[PDB]
């Protein structure tokens, strides 16, 4: 009754706290190990608590006190009544040149800075640089605690060769904590590199730290840091664009960051860039569109399509429109015809068909009147199936935005081969006769 409010209010409203609270509460309140030991840690202690509690006795429960609170080595004796006494004496005997000299000499001759620097650094120069620069579990724990505390305190309270060159040896040697290394390395490398060799120093972290945060944070971190640092100031563009574009919910961020950073960095600086960018974008868009269209069509027809259809249509339309508009200033016909026909044949029909169909005439423009026109009419007319928006939108937009190959091949093949299946003759004859007769052009030789 009064022991909870009196002991909790009197003990919580104000060593001396453990002996006064445990002695007054235990001596005045006369199952008590969790309630009496949880209050001492939830809000010269091991010597007085272990000597008074062990000498004034109530055995194994005393070990629970080790989970609560130079003088802590005696607490190791509580684990008795080189492996059950050396951790408290070696870890508490050296509990700022004392931290780097005692931690480096004691750890090298055979966690306090990370857990103690947050209280003094968050509850309110030589210790961060000396402790972080002067640093098998001792290397990973001291390097991770000193690098995380120095990087978090120095980066949050407002050089990279030691942490970048030393993180791969301890992480690779100890892995045979990704948020602190990825956030501290990405924020320190992006802020230090952008506030003023990126492939060699950044390829070890992404190539050795792999596993979704390390592989997903490298696209936005390496693309934003490499694009902002490299663009804000020939091997960096080919190595970063080839490794970043060839090494790839991470599909939207990796495809958008790699396509936007590679297209903006490669177009913001010449047939090698347009041919390599058109071949890589056409091969990646054709492979991703063919794999997503085949997997979505087989999985949806063999019986999360909004994310794959919206991400594939938005990424393909944005990448094709950005690459065509930014680069227009035998793999192209098969990749563009197979990606456009396979990705477009599966209010979104007008924007998706117009934006996905305008890249052929807009990206082609000059020439491309035989291979680019024979594959669209042959591939689009040889499949049929159930489609009407792509034929009218692609035929009306492509034939009206410029046309003789579609009307001649469609009219000659449909009229000569025609002798659900009868709906292509009326729509093809009405669309071809209305578009060709209403286009107001010469040509003739068809009536």
């Amino acid at each position: 009754h009064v022991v909870q409010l009196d002991d909790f209010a009197t003990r919580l409203k104000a060593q001396s706290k453990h002996s006064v609270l445990s002695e007054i509460c235990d001596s005045l309140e006369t199952e008590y190990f969790l309630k009496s030991l949880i209050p001492l840690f939830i809000d010269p202690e091991n010597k007085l608590r272990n000597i008074t509690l062990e000498i004034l006795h109530s055995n194994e429960i005393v070990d629970t006190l080790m989970d609560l609170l130079g003088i802590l080595c005696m607490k190791a004796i509580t684990t008795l009544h080189e492996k059950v006494h050396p951790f408290i004496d070696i870890v508490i005997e050296i509990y700022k040149q004392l931290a780097q000299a005692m931690f480096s000499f004691k750890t090298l001759a055979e966690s306090s800075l990370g857990n103690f620097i947050p209280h003094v650094m968050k509850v309110l120069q030589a210790e961060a640089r000396k402790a972080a620069e002067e640093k098998r579990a001792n290397y990973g724990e001291f390097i991770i605690g000193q690098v995380k505390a120095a990087s978090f305190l120095a980066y949050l309270f407002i050089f990279l060769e030691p942490y970048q060159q030393a993180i791969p040896d301890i992480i690779i040697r100890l892995l045979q904590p990704s948020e602190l290394s990825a956030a501290r390395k990405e924020l320190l490398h992006a802020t230090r590199h952008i506030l003023s060799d990126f492939r060699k120093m950044f390829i070890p972290k992404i190539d050795l730290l792999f596993t979704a945060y390390e592989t997903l944070r490298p696209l936005a971190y390496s693309t934003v840091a490499d694009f902002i640092h490299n663009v804000r100031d020939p091997a960096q563009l080919w190595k970063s664009v080839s490794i970043y574009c060839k090494n790839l919910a991470l599909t939207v961020q990796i495809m958008s960051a790699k396509l936007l950073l590679n297209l903006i960095e490669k177009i913001m600086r010449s047939r090698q860039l347009l041919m390599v960018i058109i071949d890589a974008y056409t091969k990646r868009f054709k492979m991703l569109n063919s794999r997503y269209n085949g997997i979505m069509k087989q999985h949806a027809t063999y019986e999360l399509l909004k994310d794959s259809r919206y991400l594939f249509k938005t990424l393909m339309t944005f990448l094709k429109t950005i690459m065509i508009g930014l680069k227009n200033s035998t793999k192209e016909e098969k990749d563009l015809m197979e990606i456009f026909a396979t990705m477009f044949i599966h209010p979104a029909s007008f924007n998706e068909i117009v934006r996905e169909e305008l890249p052929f005439m807009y990206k082609q423009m000059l020439d491309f009147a035989s291979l680019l026109h024979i594959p669209q009419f042959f591939l689009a007319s040889v499949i049929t199936s159930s489609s009407f928006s792509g034929i009218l939108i692609t035929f009306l937009k492509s034939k009206l935005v410029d046309i003789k190959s579609n009307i001649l091949i469609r009219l000659f093949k449909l009229c000569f081969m025609s002798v659900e299946s009868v709906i292509l003759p009326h729509l093809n004859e009405l669309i071809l006769k209305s578009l060709k007769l209403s286009t107001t052009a010469k040509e003739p030789l068809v009536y």
Binding site: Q176, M275, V276, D279, A280, K331
Partner: protein, 552 residues
Amino acid sequence: TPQVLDARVYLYKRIFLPICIYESEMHGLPAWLKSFDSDVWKRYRLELMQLTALKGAPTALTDMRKDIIKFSWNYLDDNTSKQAAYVVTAYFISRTPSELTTRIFVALLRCHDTRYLVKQALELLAPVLSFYPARDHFIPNIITAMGKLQQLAIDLAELILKWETKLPKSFAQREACVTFLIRYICENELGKRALNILYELLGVTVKLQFFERFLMSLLGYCLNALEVLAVALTTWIIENVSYLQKLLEKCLNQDIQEILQKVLGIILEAINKEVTNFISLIVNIIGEDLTSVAAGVSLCWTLSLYPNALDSLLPSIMRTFNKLCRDHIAISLQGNQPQSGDFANIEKVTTNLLEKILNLCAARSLDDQRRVFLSLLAQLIDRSKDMLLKVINIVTEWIFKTDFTTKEKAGILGKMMIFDLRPELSKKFNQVIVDIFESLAHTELTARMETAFLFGTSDVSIRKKLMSILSDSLEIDKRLFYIIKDQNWEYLSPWLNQALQLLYGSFENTLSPLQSITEGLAREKSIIDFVAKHNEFLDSVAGDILNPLIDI
């Protein structure tokens, strides 16, 4: 190509891939040598569709050739892809055994940095759940204990060792106590799936394991203890530890709702099959810690964990939820401390005095709170001294509903709820005629409140019927169907309004009810002869409308 141009690699790879893909996919032991040599010396539709789209010769030849070729040729992606695809397709599609079990168990158990341990441990340990009981059941202790010595090794070794070692029992004290205590005393999918599957599928050890594991224990203890203790549901420790741990750990984002709802529902349902601590702590913590999970779980648990329980307990949840949401999402009033004064009731003048004094003294997005609070308070307080409640409720409802965009909701909600729970013509006719003629809740609320209030009871009938029928018919299915069905059904059991409004307003599928019901009821139930004969004969001139006129 790594030292550097795209036409040579793209044209050589694309032009050279057709010979190996067409030759390897059209020439058929060749899939393992061609796929392993071609894929390892440097295609998914043909191998996946041909290998997955296809009785002892196929299983023995495919298992012996794939196991002998993979085990004999594997001594990085080819082993994990071929072993995972062949083991997943064969194990998932298979739902002669001596050669495959003895060869696969002896070769996989005798043939034994993250790719080798994860692919070898996951691929070699994933097929154990699909003479052999001794080596298969005894190889997991030496293989898991010798290969387990970073979350993939402990999760795959603990889940494969606990599932494989515990699945054969359907010496167990050391493996069950060490695996359950070591695996449960320590990333949420591995601990929750391994602890929930091992603790829920594994069953003197219940008292030491449950008391030591449940008493020796912040998200892992509450999630593992609540999920493991609630998935397979001595009652004082589980009820007090589950209610105190769930209320104290959840009272300080699906973990709090799932752990609190699962621990509260499993602890209350399992312990309700000492009541002051569980009822006061569960009612105070559940009623004070607070969209369908809270209303459904709080209303079903609070209304079912107690005929007067639902009506007498609906005012605390309705007044606490409406007063807490309205007083916490807008404030700027004086009704924020109503939970401590209104929730202190879970222990005919007590219900009327406590409900009328608490609701009238504590009641001093508005359509849901005003209609739900007025309808729930009036129906619950009136469905259970009559001069004070009737005069106070009629004077407060009539003065508050008549003394007020807010006029349609307040007048329609207060007049419809107060008049149906037992100056509107100018505002309803002007607002409905101006809003309906100057161009969804105004049509349903005005049509339902005006039709129900006007039809559920001499110038008011002619003015309201002529103005409502002329203004509503001179300009949509709810007004014609409700007015025609309510006027014809209520009047067929005055002839100028129904005959002139129905005959002058009915001139397509809803017109058969008025002519069929009026002609059938008026012609079969026998100034009415001129309106009935003129309206029926003039409006009936298609087999139902002409068969009754010519046959009757």
